[PDB]
Structure formats: C-alpha cells, structure tokens
Amino acid sequence: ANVDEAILKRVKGWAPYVDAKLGFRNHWYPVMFSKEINEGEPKTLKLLGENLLVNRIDGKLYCLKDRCLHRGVQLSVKVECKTKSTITCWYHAWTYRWEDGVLCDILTNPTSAQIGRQKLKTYPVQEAKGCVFIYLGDGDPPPLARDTPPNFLDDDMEILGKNQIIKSNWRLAVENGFDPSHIYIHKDSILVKDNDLALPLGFAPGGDRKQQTRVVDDDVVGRKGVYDLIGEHGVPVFEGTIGGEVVREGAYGEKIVANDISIWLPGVLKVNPWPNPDMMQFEWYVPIDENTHYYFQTLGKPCANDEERKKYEQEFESKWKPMALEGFNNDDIWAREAMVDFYADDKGWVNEILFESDEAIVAWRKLASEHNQGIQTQAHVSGLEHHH
Amino acid sequence: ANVDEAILKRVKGWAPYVDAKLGFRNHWYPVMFSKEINEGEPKTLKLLGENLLVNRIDGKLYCLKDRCLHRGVQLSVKVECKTKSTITCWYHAWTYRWEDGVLCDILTNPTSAQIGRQKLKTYPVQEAKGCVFIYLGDGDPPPLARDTPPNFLDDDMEILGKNQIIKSNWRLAVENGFDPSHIYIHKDSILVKDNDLALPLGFAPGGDRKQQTRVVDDDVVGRKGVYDLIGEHGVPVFEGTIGGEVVREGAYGEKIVANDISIWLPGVLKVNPWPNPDMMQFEWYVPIDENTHYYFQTLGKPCANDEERKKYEQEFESKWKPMALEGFNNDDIWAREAMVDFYADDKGWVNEILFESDEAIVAWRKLASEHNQGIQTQAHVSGLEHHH
Amino acid sequence: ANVDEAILKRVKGWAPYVDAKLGFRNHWYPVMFSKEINEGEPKTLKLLGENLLVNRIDGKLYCLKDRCLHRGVQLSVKVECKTKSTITCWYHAWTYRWEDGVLCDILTNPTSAQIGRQKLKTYPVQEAKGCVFIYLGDGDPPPLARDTPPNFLDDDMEILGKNQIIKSNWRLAVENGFDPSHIYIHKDSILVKDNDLALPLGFAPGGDRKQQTRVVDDDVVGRKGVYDLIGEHGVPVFEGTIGGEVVREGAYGEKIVANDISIWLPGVLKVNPWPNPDMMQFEWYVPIDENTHYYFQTLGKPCANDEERKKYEQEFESKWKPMALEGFNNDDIWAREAMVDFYADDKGWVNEILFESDEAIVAWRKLASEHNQGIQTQAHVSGLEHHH
Amino acid sequence: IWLKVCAASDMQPGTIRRVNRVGAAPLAVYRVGDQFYATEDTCTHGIASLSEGTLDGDVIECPFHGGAFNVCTGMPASSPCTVPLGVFEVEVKEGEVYVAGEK
Amino acid sequence: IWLKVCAASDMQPGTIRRVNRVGAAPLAVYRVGDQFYATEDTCTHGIASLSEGTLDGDVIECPFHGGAFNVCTGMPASSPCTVPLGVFEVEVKEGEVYVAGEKK
Amino acid sequence: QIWLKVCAASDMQPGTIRRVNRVGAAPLAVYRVGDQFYATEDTCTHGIASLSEGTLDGDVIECPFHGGAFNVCTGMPASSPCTVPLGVFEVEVKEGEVYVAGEKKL
Ligand code: FES
Ligand code: FES
Ligand code: FES
Ligand code: FES
Ligand code: FES
Ligand code: FES
Ligand SMILES: [Fe+2]
Ligand SMILES: [Fe+2]
Ligand SMILES: [Fe+2]
16 A cells, blocks of 8 residues: 555556565664664664664663654654663653663653553664664564575674665665676676676576576575576676677676575575675665665675684775775666666556566565565554554 | 545544644734834735735835735735835736725736726734734734733733744644643753743642643633643652652752743743743744744733833843743754654644643643634635635 | 646636646657757757657767666666667666667677567657757657748748746746736846837737737648737837826837737747847747746847858847847746746636736637647656556 | 617527627626526636636636636626626516616 | 442443542443443543543544544554553442442 | 467367467467467567466456556557557467467568
8 A cells, every 4th residue: 555556456466565665564674783883872763764763771782763652753852861771752751661662751740640551662673793683573573584695694704894875765776686687787897807707798598487596485594585597597698789799798807706696585685706706795775765775785704713804804994895885886876776767656667668687576576575574554654543 | 624534533622723734814923023124115924824915104014915816926026116005016017005905007908907806815914012913814803912812912011022933833833832841841941040940840730630721711802722720739840750760850940930821822822920020921833834833932021111111122132032032942943843743744643642731732722623713724825716 | 637627627718728737749849959969979858758868870860768668767877879870778788779769789688589679769850940859749740840930940040049947837938928918027128228129018908809819720831829919909008007197118219029929839939020120039938847948049030141140140149149038038037937836736727817918828828729739648758558 | 778688589598698888898698598697798807708608507607717606696606706796687578688787 | 349320221322421530530431232331531542531532332432533442341443542441340230330440 | 380289279268378388489378269269479568478377358468567468369559558569370270279370470
C-alpha cells in the first residue's frame, strides 16, 4: 500500500519489492561505525523513515525512538540525560529508561497515572566488526548473520570502511550494485589502471536463464540472496563495437577480481575478490526514507595478528579507501541518482525495457519479494492504525 | 473540510478545532502596531491565508483584499493610488474605493459595464491600544471586546508590544502557551533568576477534573475562554526526581506571578501578573497560513498619567521587552516548532498521549470547537464554491 | 486529463484549452537559434515536459528523446558519441542512431536480442530564419508555415531575436501578449518616449462582439489564429480618469505602430508594425513544463542584401534588443508572473471576472480549443498507457 | 412601458432568446415549459451571454464559468456568480410575450 | 469489596455508567445485552473518560481519539490504544449490580 | 526444419500456452484459443519475459513482467507498455499433430 494498486497489479513477478519503497522491516541494518558513538553521547539518525537515538552506556549500545510519547517532539532537540540510565524529554520532562523504554518518571508531575504504564519504542542494537547494526523490527531479533553476507563475520576478517548519505531510493542502489552490465561506467576508473585490474566492458550471456544466477534459500544461517553467474558461460566483452568498428576496449590488466558477486537481503552486496585479489568488499544500501539511503561501504581482509592488521589500515587509508571506495564507487553514486526520475513516479517499474544481463536483477527482485521479513509503511512511521 | 474525514471522525471531542488548520473566520485579529502604518502608505500582509492591503486615509485605516477581481493579481505588485480615496490595479487599471471596495472606474475602458457592478472584498479594521485589529469575517462585526481578554481594553491600561512571524501552525502556539506543565522549558530562564520569580517545574494535580479549569461561556461582551486552575488545589513541584534521587530544582523566587492564566477565542492568552507583580501579558497567535502565525506579544500596565506611561515605555524597552518578551518567551518559539512534524500529517491529533495537566488543553479544544464563529477553508481563500 | 474534471466541466467554451496545461502536441515549436547549436555539440532542452537532446551532424539537426530506453536515465548526464552518427548511453552502452533512434548496438552485450528491435523516440527538427523548430508530435509533420505567423517566412524578412526561460505557464504569456488592454502596463516604457510612439492607455470598444476580432481558419497554409480588431470601432483612451478627473494620459507620439495584432496556434503573437513602422515582432510562448515557458522573441525587417542585413543587425544589438525586446517587454514578464498564483490551482479559470476587451482572449481560447492538434498529457511524458 | 418580444410559439420549450435594446443592455427571455421569464442577458460575473448558456429547469447556467442563476428570482444558484441578476416580469397575453421595461 | 452501582433495570442494553469512587479513580460499567462489565473509566491512551464514549457490542470507543477496548477482556480493539484496560469483576445480586472496586 | 512438431492437438487444453524451444534460435510460444492454434515468439518484445509464463485471455496474451499484452493471432500489441509487434509463426495440424513454422510470417 505504498504504491498505486494499478502498478502493483502489473508487476506480478515482484509486487512486494516494488511496494517496499520505505524498505523491509524486521531486518538488521548498519547505520554507523562503533568509533562514531561515544559513551554518554547520544546520536541521532533516521532509519526506514523513523527518527532514532543511539546511546552508549557502560560500553553497551541502546536505541530509543527519537519521539516523545506525549506531544511527539524529538527528544534530541534538547538532550537531557539526567541519570546514567535515563533520558528526560526537554518539554514536559517525561523520563524514559534506555534499556526498556519504560516511562519511569515525569518531573512535571511525579503523581501522574502515566508513569510506569507507557513505553517508548526501543530497537535491538548490536556491534560487530566495528559496525553498529540496528534491528528495525519487532520482537526478539534473529541472529545478525541472517542479514549479513557470507564471511563478513569471520573471526580473522578485519573490517574497515566509510558511510555517507546518498540521494536515491535504496532499491536503485541495490540494483546498480548487482547489475552485471553496469561495469561499463567504471571503464575509466583510476583503480582499473593504477591497480592493473582485468575489467571487461560487459558480457555476452551463455546458457539457459536458470544458469545465469544461483538463488540461495537453503543457507543454514537463514541468509537469502542471489549469486551473479553471468561469467560462468558468458563471453566477456573486451572490444566494444559500433557498426562492426571497435570504438572501445576493456581493461587488459593482470589482476583477476570480482569473479564472485552476490546480493543479500535486506540489501547488501558482496564482491569477491575486490578491490584486490586478497580482499573483499561488503556494501549496504540502507533505507533512510523513500528518497535517501546510507551507502555503507566496508572492505575486508583476513588478518591473523595485531600487525598487518595495522598495515592493512595504513593501506586502507592510503590506497583502498581513496582509490576504490571513492575513486571507483563514486561513479555508482551519480548512476543511482540518474535513475531517480524514471522511478520517482513508480512508473519506471513498468516502462523499463530490460535486456539479458538484467536476469540477475529480476532474480533479486523475486527473492526480495518472497523472502523479505516485512514491508515498512508510513503507518509504521506515524503510528500503526487498525480496527480489530 | 481541511482534514482527512477519517481523522475528524476519530476526534469527536473537538473535530471543528482539528479541522480549523487555517484558523477561525469571523473574529478580530491583531496584525501590526498602529505606528507601523502611516498616512497614504499601503501595507501588505497575509491573514487566515488571505492576502490583504491596509492603508491609512485621513488618519483612518481601511483594508481591501490584495487580489484584483479581474485576473487575480496582487495589486501590491505595483501600487498605484492615483487619488486619495482609491487604488488602481497596475495591470488594466481597474480602480477601487478603499471605503467600500467598489469598482468605481476602469482607466483602460471608461465605458465598461463592470464599473459600479463589482466589489472587491473589504474587512473591518480597528485600532485599539496602539494595535491594529482586522475582522477577518463577513457581515457586521461584533464588538472588539468580544475577541480580547478581560482588561486589555481598560481605559488606563498602557499597552506596549512586539510582533513577528513564527513557523508553526497557530494551534501549536496556543496549546504551548496555555500548557500548565510547559513551564519546565523555562526553568533556566534569565528572567526568573534576575527578576527573582517563583517558578515550579510543574504541578501535582489536586481535586477533581472539573476543578482543574474554569470555562467562561459568556461575558457581558460575549467572550469565550478557559482559566487554568491547576494551582488551586495542585501541589507545586520544585524538586525534580528520577528513581527517587533529586536531579533538578525549580526556582525559589519571592515574587509570585502568573496566578491568573486564561486562553480566549480566537486564540489569545492572558497571564496575570507577568512578568512583574504590576503588569500583565496578553499574546495572540494569529493564523497567517497553515504553517505560520504572528506571535503578537503585548505587556500592559495601568498608568494614570503621561509620567507613568513615559516611565513604563522606558522600562519596557530597557528591561521587559528584552528580558521577558524575548528572553523568556524565546524558548516557547522553538518548543512550538518542535511539535510541527508530529501534527503536520494531522496524525498527531490522534496519536498524542496526554497526561493530567493536559486537562487545560482539552478544555480549550472543546471550548474552541463549540464557540468559534466559523472555520476558514481554502475555498474562502480562492473563492467560495457551490454547484446547484 | 491534466485538470480536475469538475473544473473542465465548468469551462464548456474552452475546456481543451484549460486542460492543455502542458501545451498542444503535434505542432512545431522554436526552442533556440541556429547559432546556438554547433557541429557535434549535443544540447539538452525540455519541451512540453519532455527532455530532449539536439545535435548537429554534417550540418543537419537531429532530435532524440533524452531518456535511455533501458533504465530511463538521461543520456546527457554523460554524453558518449563514439561514432559520428550515434550516441552511446553511459550506463550500459545501448547505442542509438541520431537519424532514426534505432537501437543499433549495445557494447555491453553484442548478442542481445534487443539490438535492432527497439527505437528511441525522435522528433523532426527544422531550421528556418536562423531559428530551430522542433515538431513535438507523432507521424509525418505538416508544413512549418502552418505553425508560424504570416510573413515570418517571407524570403526577404530578416529575423533576429532573443530567447529565455520565464517562470509562468505558457497560456498566461499568450493571453497577456494578445490582451488589448494590458498596454496600460507599458505606459512608462522608455521605448514609447525614446521612439516617439503613439500609445493609448486602452480602448473603449465599439460595435458588436463579432467585430472585436477576426477568426482566421480560412488561411490556405492552414494556419489558425485571431486578429485583435478592437481599434476598428473603438475609441482609444488617451485621458485616464477617476471620478471624471484626469489622472493619467497616454503617449501622443507621431509613429503609428501595432496596427495589426494577431495570435496564432500553437502560441505565437505577431505585432505589426513594431517596434518601428518598418519592422514586425513575432514572439512565441513555448511550453517547457506546466510552470515555465520559453519567451522566444524575434524582430523581422525586410532586407534586400547582405549590406542591409548587417545594418539591421547592428541596430538590433544597439537599440531594438535593449530598448524594445528588453526595455518594453520586460514589463510583460513580471505581469505574467503576477497571474501565476490565481491560476496555479486551476481555479482562476473559473473565478476570473472578465471585461469587454477580454473578448479577444475568449476568441483565442475558443480557437485554440477547436483547432489545436492534440493535448499533451503527463502520460506522453512518462509513457503512454492502455489496457486491453 | 412593456416590450413586445415575440409569439409564444416562436420559442420551443427550454430555449433562450436574446432581446437587444438600442441604447440599453440586452435581455434574455427564457421559456421553461410553457412559462416565460426574463433577466439581463449579461452574466453578472463577466461578459458572457446567458442566452448562449444552458437552461436546466428554471436555472440558467452561464457558458463561461459554470456560474448559474434562478431565472425566476435572478438569485445566484451556482458559484462563482454572486451578484443577483436583474429580473423583468413577463406576461403572456393572447399568445404574445411581453417583457417589462424595468425590474 | 463490592460497590453498590445501580439496579440492573436502571441501565438499558448498550449503555455505559460511570462509577465515581471516593479517594480513587473512576470506573466504567457497561451493560452489553443482559450482562454487565466494568473497567477503569480513564482511557489508557490518555485522560479521556470512556463512559463518555460509544459502546458497540462489547467494544467501547474512546471519545478523544477513537481508540477502543473490549469491555470484557480490557484488551485494546482499535488504535491508537495499546495498553490493556484494568477490568473489575461485576456481580448482579437480586436486581442490583455491584462492582468489585478491586482490580481483577 | 520448415515445420516443427510441437505436440498432439489433444495434448493442449483450450486457453493454454506451450513453450517451444529451438536449437540455435529463440523459443516460440504456441497458444490454443478454442480449437484453433496460434504461435509467436515466446520472448516479450518489451523485455526478457517469457510469454508462455503469462496469462491468456481469449486471443490476448498478457506478459507476467509488466502487464503488457499482445494479440496472439496478429502479434500486435494489446496493452502498454508493449509497442513492438511479435513475430507470428503459422501453425498447422496434420494427423491431429500440431506443427509450428520454423520461419515467421512476412
Ligand atoms: S512532549 Fe515530551 S514530555 Fe511533553
Ligand atoms: S488584473 Fe487588475 S485590472 Fe486586470
Ligand atoms: S540506462 Fe542506458 S544502456 Fe542502461
Ligand atoms: S462570466 Fe458567467 S459565470 Fe463567469
Ligand atoms: S485518550 Fe482514549 S484513544 Fe486517546
Ligand atoms: S517484459 Fe513484457 S511487458 Fe515488459
Ligand atoms: Fe558499480
Ligand atoms: Fe512558555
Ligand atoms: Fe505587453
């Protein structure tokens, strides 16, 4: 009910996905790095359209909805944490506990009947690999692994990265990321030349439809995703032609990368190896609201000891972060933005003219529609509405 | 007419008030001070969503709608007052009399059949206590006293004030002003400390609900309002506690002020005494459009002669204005702005969780719903519609 | 359907016109001057709500819709013309021929079944009198002469002009231009004084309605328009009066100009002679979107050779452009903008109170409603829709 | 004082006839069923001719903006019309329609 | 423990009766058909008096925001209400109704 | 081969669709409308969808991807967003056996 019913009736193959303009509820989402949230210093953020507050108390993170139950103001306008375990609204002093959101006191009226009877929404928060994950859902959360790509949580896998807000719906980011033929926009990337990478312009598909991908729905951890196998039978394009004349060539570098690409619910891509044969890239496209998303980038590299783990960081800052995460992925950013207009009115979901390599995207759309854990709605944002 | 019918259906206790997003028609509203408009110098303003023009001719004020009958342009784009008693539209020269809005001439066609056959909307304007009031309504206006708080018009009451545009719907301003527990936001006020005022953090209600307020359904002049009596049997709260430990304290000043607080239609608050034992504050929250209002503040003090009023004016400019009107009330301004989001989609009127001191607000909502003289609609702004 | 059906039902005399908020499809429209588009330099523009790309190849102009068939991005975000006769989308390399829009190649997949089976929308482009005209329509275009005022295409008529984007719907511009009484806004024009022009303040109409204009639908080239004949039986107003007393006079210059004023579909005005007895002014109000238009101004003056053309050019840049096109018409620009609010909600089309000289505008509204070649709809912009 | 307009049979039911008056504003004569009424012809909201409008029962709808008036009372029946129409009593005698010279 | 409310006959089916208690919060007594029920009078979502609301079957609708509760179970029936209402045991003894005046 | 053997006419129920895969060529879709048979390319001209996985309504097939549609007899578009006509292949029944042409109609 986020999109015109007429359009949903048309996209019979993935209507839930097209309706999920605000993202999927009941999944874990990374929103910041552990280093960005300090003890006793609450931070604000918007996730799936909801304003939230995250605080660190005795080293542990807590998440409360940033909206007072009384008159609906954001507590963050003027933060008043009067005791270690609570936060007091600046307006009429309704006070809530960070651990369970219970309204435990009201300074403007200590005798109010509301005390102890109301509860502000709280969301589970977990830190892993130096990343802050919030379970934007209801009830006890599933393990974080269900919503992370394979190997992200490996013991020796050292994770580093960056995050920023991008102006496009999260779905446009996901599809661009899993798009087999979009590598064409990266043909002039510095990382390509500078890191001597082998990078074609596209692929001439081979085999049947089913062979183009590997849909994963038998993962013991509960993971649900899709693998892009266009390269298994497809002939990579290194000489692009027009009228039979070669007008462009791919990158004939020596380093073999990105032979393993997969997208996983709620919306995280895994590219392996990348940006180097001994590394991996994991990136999330987190829904902030219908028009924006967090582009949460991470690069992983196994490290067995405190050293090298340090050399990795040094190289991350010196090469990987500026040359790959930025130098390479920056083109993905404006590419996402370029699709905004066509899909803004939801009509792009009907008028798009797909071609062979989009089989991977269609597979993702179907997987997401069938295995998402809930459709976030504006009602979830303002307050659920119902008549039993 | 202005809100989703499903929402109005839910708020049975005050549907008209919730619907009155643009304000109440057929009431007097202050919009500027007398000294802000000089002889033959037309001034523009927007009230209840309507663009208006006010001019002073031979000392008297006149108000015409700032929209030519012909092609709907604002006359004020290029003012042309070619004779003392008229204004000529800059486009095709349709000319109107300030006195009755009659189309008395058309320079581009002196033989037009429209001449003397059309009338531009006019609104009554009255000056009192140095304030300019406009009756944004139809037909003969009621006495100005009906729409003003008691004593504002007293012969000896010397009125001085300030006015500005605030970005919030007028109702959020009204409710914040009459909110008994909102004083919590003023706990760190410089006025309270410097003027040694007694100011609790809030009140623990005493007595029954009916005793919390006093509704005035009629006066010798027909005014409609509500008095906040939470302090009659309520216990002032000076110590703020959380989990039993003291985390805050109210102000233990000696000066007892604000023992008399009342809100009146169309939306004007009276606080007496304030900000000093010998003064009173009268403030209006005038609807400009759905998202903004004029915060028209005035401080009154009885003065018997020119000596007292001269001294008062000096005290006002050097102390009361900067310390009270600005220093104290500035916190009310951002408090109002903080409630905008929750009520912007009109859902806050359903999802708000009220507590005891809100009995005052509820009383106002009901009084306003039962005695307002009309609901301003977008149709009033563009032109009333009706199809036989 | 671009307007609330209730409103369209009310304006029975010209509903199609009121519905044509985006302009009339299947007409030629000038969008720039030939000197503004150079060989191999693609230029972007929006016409009738559609984003277009124009390019010059071997001297000839070609027009392609600036929206890739694949994922709906604008090709112009990053232009890639790899061969003289084609353009390659920067995203997945779908390549189209400028000549017919046929998808002739796809660099990311040379085996794609889409190759040669899709075609991007193209529109006829024609250069005449140094002006670039685009036929925003479907099928074989009619002769350009049909959509141009008489004499604009005369062999010796030398055309010079200026173009800019104005913030108002195209119809407000058309009506202001053909509005007989709007000349009142030009009473203080520097051009009038500095060129000794005779210019009344308005007109007292004479004769019956039919005589106020001449509806043209008998032109052999098929052009459809209306001539303003208010001055044939009307009395020019040179002494403007209020209450019978003269408050303003018109201009008593010696030069006789503006003897013939005519408006033509799709929306081009011809004033003759103007701004001098031996010149003519032809101006278009081209729909860009519902809120803006190109104000395409041109001045024509018969020239028999290169020597006269150069002389005229010099007088144009030094006098006519700054004094007439800018100094005189600049008042028309803000006049158009002043009507935006009244008509923005489409209600002005119902609430406007017209007077005698508006007979000219009504005639135009009726002609446009009856002879336009199609109503541009948002569906034309996003993609025509239809269910079996 | 009265003005002889036409024969009752000159008008079919539900039709309107414009009556020009030299040196004066035109009038509109309406035939509602077998009854006759008259008002000023010019819509009070603009320059439209009500005789070029649509008659629905005893309500005339202006062709320009959809405003309307009750031809019997001359009072506005639909917005944007707000100024009442001038009404002229009409009487039919011996199959002849006469319209008063004044309102 | 029981409080004298009124004679069962004083209440027509589908009506609500507020029961004010000395030094305590008010209660609401509902007559659904031929059976009586009771809960707190104050809506758990705010400060509204449910006795001034509308009874539809066994569901009481709050006059303030349209939230609702099942008068038998005290469980929320319509948004925005989410906090269960306190239910009090009712007893009809010899024509007259009584309320436990004690949370069940 | 000129005529490709598809199946027994009786093996198809009225209102059903059957996909015909071909070596070295794009798949075809055979439709049974009443007692008659028609055939077109299987791939929707608007994308990469398989029309045989769509919904047949009379002589109009609806694509499962975006709701576009085609008339199976003429191959002409019946519903947006489809705009490119489908290639149609003649179908004949010899000895109760359905045969579809290897080359589309001109
Ligand atoms: S809005 Fe938070 S305590 Fe009132
Ligand atoms: S818009 Fe004012 S006179 Fe024409
Ligand atoms: S969006 Fe243009 S080739 Fe894909
Ligand atoms: S001119 Fe008759 S309704 Fe406007
Ligand atoms: S106070 Fe009862 S629904 Fe809000
Ligand atoms: S792929 Fe068939 S309608 Fe789009
Ligand atoms: Fe990319
Ligand atoms: Fe305040
Ligand atoms: Fe002009």
